[PDB]
Paper text:
These flavoproteins share a conserved FAD-binding domain and a more variable substrate-binding domain that enables interactions with a range of substrates. One of these, the 4-phenol oxidases/dehydrogenases, catalyzes the oxidation of para-substituted phenolic compounds. A fundamental distinction is that the oxidases efficiently react with oxygen producing hydrogen peroxide whereas the dehydrogenases hardly react with oxygen and typically employ other proteins, such as cytochrome c, as acceptors.
We found that P151V and [name] can operate with oxygen although they are 10- to 40-fold less efficient compared to using 2,6-dichlorophenolindophenol as co-substrate. The crystal structures of the six P151 mutants were also solved. They are closely similar to the wild-type regarding the substrate-binding residues whereas loop 150-153 locally undergoes localized rearrangements, with each mutant adopting a distinct conformation. In general, the oxidase-active variants (P151L, P151G, [name], P151V) all adopt the trans conformation that slightly shifts the amino acid at position 151 away from the flavin. The analysis revealed a consistent pattern: in the oxidase mutants, the 150-153 loop conformations create tunnels that lead to the flavin re side.
Author numbering:
A (entry chain B), B (entry chain A): 1 to 519
């Protein structure tokens, strides 16, 4: 069925807004009726077809068009859902929390405004993908790397704004942000930091500028529409050595995490540490059906088969060394020696891997900032599906790591899904990441997923583990877990929302922030 | 003469507030009349005694007391000026922008709530000084370094909040912040990040939490009172080797900066790179009168004598190597070879320095996070004085460095002061700092200081160079330089101010932000 109107908005107001939008961007750039279906969540979760349905989409070609759209949204009380490229698959794609919202899709604003080799930065518009920025760098021969998520068709901007991550030393994308331009909810435009000074040549060199540091408030936010963003890029290193360390027992994750802690805190491991479980790594190059006829999750005997077929452990730590050989060698000594006495441990460099198609060769590309789309092949583990993830924060402790693995793998399997988990460390933060692959077409799998997901949130929150990024469906649920002092923080978010966006026309429900008209 | 009432505020209103403060914190911790003097700017600039005059101070012992003081301040329209320890010398000390404001001094809230060695962090109240935190760590033998902004009797919190800097790899103090508790302008209390989740053990492990990133809005801000703050602490490295590289010609700073850029952008130089002018460094161990008895700034012939006497250059690049010897050697090779071909260059490690009281031996302490009061020595250059700083930000270019040296050195000397310069480098940013030592007791010196400062700012802005931190006297003036799109950014700051602080009772005028009742 069709999307309903957003509540409080008549057909006449919607119809008028949509025609006014068209006068701004052109009639070819407003999408209604059958043209809306790319804007739906590709990985459907609700069995209720009235939920999370975009009414329409508008695709501007400039900041000045964005500003006009936002003015028109306020005129008609029609809410917008800003996306940079709208490829937030796992988190709802380009779909809004609240049905009836209109997607403001900025993919056509795709100017690379600057790439600066000597200072190691780019200034990009939202529509620039990782492929595009990577391609531009290679074609100009600049000695710079990007930092990519596992998949490269998303937005350098959009990803950063949702607190996305990659797998080089610059893997905390928002932390590497510097300078931005924002269209505020009233349609006026501002620049942050040194961008606020006329004639500056420092916008992308110095984060703070002067006064309150506000860039952060426009991440995981509905306070503004970002139209330009600077980002630091890593100079090409003098060397690069990707590695895989595998562990034969599920219980090894406890001691593994203890050994990871001082190496990450001291910065001996230079990129994000990712320790992936067997099935998650195996699903890159293989399907369940090739090892197992069963309908349900794999049994232990299959696991042992897979390990030996693929030379993977139950836990698989990928990382990389960057810099001159003498540095890489020193850091490696410390890393290898931290794990050598663990019964069953295996160590691998690319030249040690006997398969042409192989997990370490795959992840080696990502850890040097090469964009690809191969990661989507893991969705075929169980025939073909979508995915959704649960990625709360815990201390980098063996106990926290194995508690969460025990907690989650039992629950996920209880609902018939294979456990596909990952223990990730940024700098001081561990995340047990649950990855759930599901038949999105099946109302019954959908129902099981929703129920499982809610259990995971509550059981983690009961342990003081909080999620930092989530699907549109769970944004309210996650917001409600940050309840210290009777939800004091969200009360402050709502206050700021009401001040910047009195009419509530940017992304109602994003991060569980609604605005006075709708709460 | 004595401090005037803040405009709009009855004398009865003030007496009532002050009475009610006294019952919140006890009579012994409300300071008027003779006990106000410590809260005056110690380095006066205004010759008008009506300005920056605090009416009173209140010194609470807990968050609950801060909340009550804020609520009272709202009731009577009495403005507060929050300080953590109030040692902001060169920037106004503990004095407010607006006369009549009451200082909210949180010195006595000096609990070290947690130092955690395995995760490298501290959670501190505002009154915790660098001396106190260091001493704590040493007493317990925790293998952690702090990062000190030279002077040790300042606040870990307050310094970070004003975007202060130190001289180890953890030198961007606000960047190392993680979690805070804030009393908002209405008296309610919030925790940011994971602190917003009950039962978390992750407040100091993961900055973002969920939703908008807001910690930054409480820095260089009057949007709230910070009452707790986490900060990341560096694990003790396996090795430490500080160094000094001197250069004998003032024009060398051009090529020096060009060579620093790649080294810093790539992180080969691991800490804050300071390049200090001769007089700034010499003034640590000698006075002007040892070399020259004239009233004005030193001539070239004296500079040469000073250089020979102290083993200092016209430019003095202090930095440090950190970690295992193999790493330090590799990094040193790249650093040395960057500077080795410059005519007149000299390299020193500590063992090379003949003087027993010596710049490099002092700076060696600072660059491994040892709090000291030595830096105050440069105030004795010309018999005794205070100082003020002008700290604009530039790109790391030779051309920008030398342009700024020439512009500022010219002007400072013209106005009868010696040039003391500190080209510091963060990550991608050149912060050419001028430090001006003057006789704060002398009305004529103050007058010509003011006149020089105003010129330095205007001439910097004309080149696209903006200041990132300033003295209370100049906060409006600096704010007005960030004027892109008809002051768009301050208009947004003022919108947020009015939402969070409608009565405008927190530090009116901080960072040029005033609130609807006073603009
Ligand atoms: C197999 C697989 C692997 C993945 N791996 C990763 C990974 O390694 N790392 C990772 O981070 N993610 C990963 N993802 C999640 C996600 O698909 C990517 O992060 C993706 O790049 C995000 O979409 P995007 O870049 O187009 O951002 P967008 O969809 O454009 O933006 C995401 C959200 O940010 C906000 N937003 C975006 N732009 C703006 C703006 N200009 N103004 C205001 N708000 C804005 C909106 O809330 C929007 O919904 C993975 C997903 C899958 C299925
Ligand atoms: C000789 C000399 C050398 C110096 N060297 C350095 C240096 O190397 N690096 C450097 O960074 N600085 C330096 N300074 C400047 C300054 O003296 C220090 O930065 C000092 O640490 C700042 O004072 P404080 O720590 O007591 O902070 P405070 O004075 O307590 O705080 C400064 C400001 O922050 C805000 N603030 C503080 N606490 C709160 C709170 N709890 N809630 C809300 N707002 C708050 C207020 O606006 C306040 O006025 C130097 C100064 C001199 C005189």
């Amino acid at each position: 069925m069709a999307a309903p109107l957003p509540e409080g908005v008549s057909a006449e107001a919607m119809s008028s807004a949509l025609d006014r939008f068209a006068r701004i961007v052109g009639a070819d750039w407003v999408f209604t009726e059958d043209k809306i279906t790319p804007y739906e969540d590709p990985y459907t979760i609700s069995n209720d077809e009235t939920e999370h349905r975009p009414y329409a989409a508008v695709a501007p070609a400039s900041t000045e068009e964005v500003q006009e759209i936002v003015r028109v949204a306020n005129e008609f009380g029609v809410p917008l859902w800003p996306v940079s490229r709208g490829k937030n698959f796992a988190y709802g794609g380009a779909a809004p929390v609240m049905s009836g919202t209109v997607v403001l899709d900025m993919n056509r604003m795709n100017r690379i405004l600057e790439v600066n080799e000597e200072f190691g930065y780019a200034l990009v518009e939202p529509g620039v993908s990782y492929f595009e920025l990577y391609d531009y760098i290679q074609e100009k021969g600049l000695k710079l790397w990007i930092d990519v998520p596992d998949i490269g068709w998303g937005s350098v901007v959009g990803n950063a704004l949702d607190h996305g991550i990659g797998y080089t030393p610059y893997g905390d994308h928002f932390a590497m942000q510097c300078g931005m331009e924002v269209v505020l909810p009233n349609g006026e435009v501002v620049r942050t930091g040194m961008g606020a000074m006329p004639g500056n040549n420092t916008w992308q060199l110095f984060k703070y500028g002067y006064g309150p540091y506000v860039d952060g408030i426009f991440s995981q936010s509905n306070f503004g529409v970002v139209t330009k963003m600077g980002i630091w890029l890593m100079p090409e290193p003098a060397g690069y050595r990707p590695y895989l360390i595998t562990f034969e027992n599920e219980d090894d994750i406890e001691t593994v995490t203890e050994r990871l802690r001082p190496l990450k805190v001291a910065g001996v491991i230079q990129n994000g540490a990712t320790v992936r479980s067997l099935v998650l790594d195996a699903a890159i190059t293989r399907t369940k059906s090739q090892y197992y006829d069963g309908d349900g999750p794999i049994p232990p005997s299959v696991a042992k088969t897979m390990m030996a077929d693929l030379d993977l452990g139950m836990w698989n730590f990928c990382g990389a060394l960057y810099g001159p050989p003498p540095v890489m060698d020193t850091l490696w000594t410390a890393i290898r020696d931290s794990f050598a006495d663990i019964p069953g441990v295996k160590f691998y460099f690319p030249e040690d891997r006997r398969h042409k198609v192989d997990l370490l060769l795959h992840r080696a590309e990502t850890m040097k900032g090469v964009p690809k789309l191969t990661e989507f092949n893991f969705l075929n583990w169980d025939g073909g599906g979508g995915h959704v993830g649960f990625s709360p924060v815990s201390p980098i402790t063996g106990k926290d790591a194995i508690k969460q693995y025990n907690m989650v793998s039992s629950r996920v399997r209880e609902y018939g899904f294979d456990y596909m988990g990952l223990l990730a460390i940024g700098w001081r933060d561990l995340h047990h990441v649950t990855v759930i692959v599901y038949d999105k077409t099946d109302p019954d799998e959908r129902k099981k997923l929703d129920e499982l997901f809610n259990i995971l949130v509550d059981e983690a929150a009961a342990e003081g583990y909080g999620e930092y990024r989530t699907h549109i469906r769970y944004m309210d649920r996650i917001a409600k877990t940050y309840s210290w002092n009777d939800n004091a923080l969200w009360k402050m978010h709502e206050t700021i929302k009401d001040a910047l966006d009195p009419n509530g026309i940017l992304a109602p429900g994003k991060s569980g922030i609604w605005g006075k008209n709708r709460r």
